[PDB]
Nucleic acid binder design. Structure first.
Length: 58
RNA sequence: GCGCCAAGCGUCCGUCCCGGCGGGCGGGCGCGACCCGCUCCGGGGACAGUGCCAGGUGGGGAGUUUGACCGGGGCGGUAC
């Protein structure tokens, strides 16, 4: 094997290195219509849904 | 001072070559860089705030008024 080859590890600690490109899907500033849809699903899980509307979950 | 655009591993290809495996040439994916959980993070919160009515305050502002007689008017008087 070639002795020139080497491991060059980078530690992603606080400071001392630049962070890699990781998934930011949980911290994206989504457009206002995506926010509207997702919050509307949360509201249906958060509020007291009356039985006549809740019976369609089943 | 320097710090990014991955090293290193582990696999999958070639309609590509040279002796099913090997070597060369060019690529792909995964780990490196853990997984799951519904609101980006934090601070308040059914209060603040907004809409409508009710009470107080309000020369900051608006509009108006501030009699008459009278040896001039005013002051004084009322002989109004």
């Amino acid at each position: 094997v070639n002795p020139l080859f080497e491991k060059r590890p980078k530690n992603f600690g606080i400071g001392q290195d630049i962070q890699p490109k990781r998934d930011l899907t949980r911290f994206v500033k989504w457009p206002r219509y995506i926010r509207l849809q997702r919050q509307r699903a949360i509201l249906y899980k958060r509020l007291k849904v009356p039985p006549a509307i809740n019976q369609f979950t089943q």
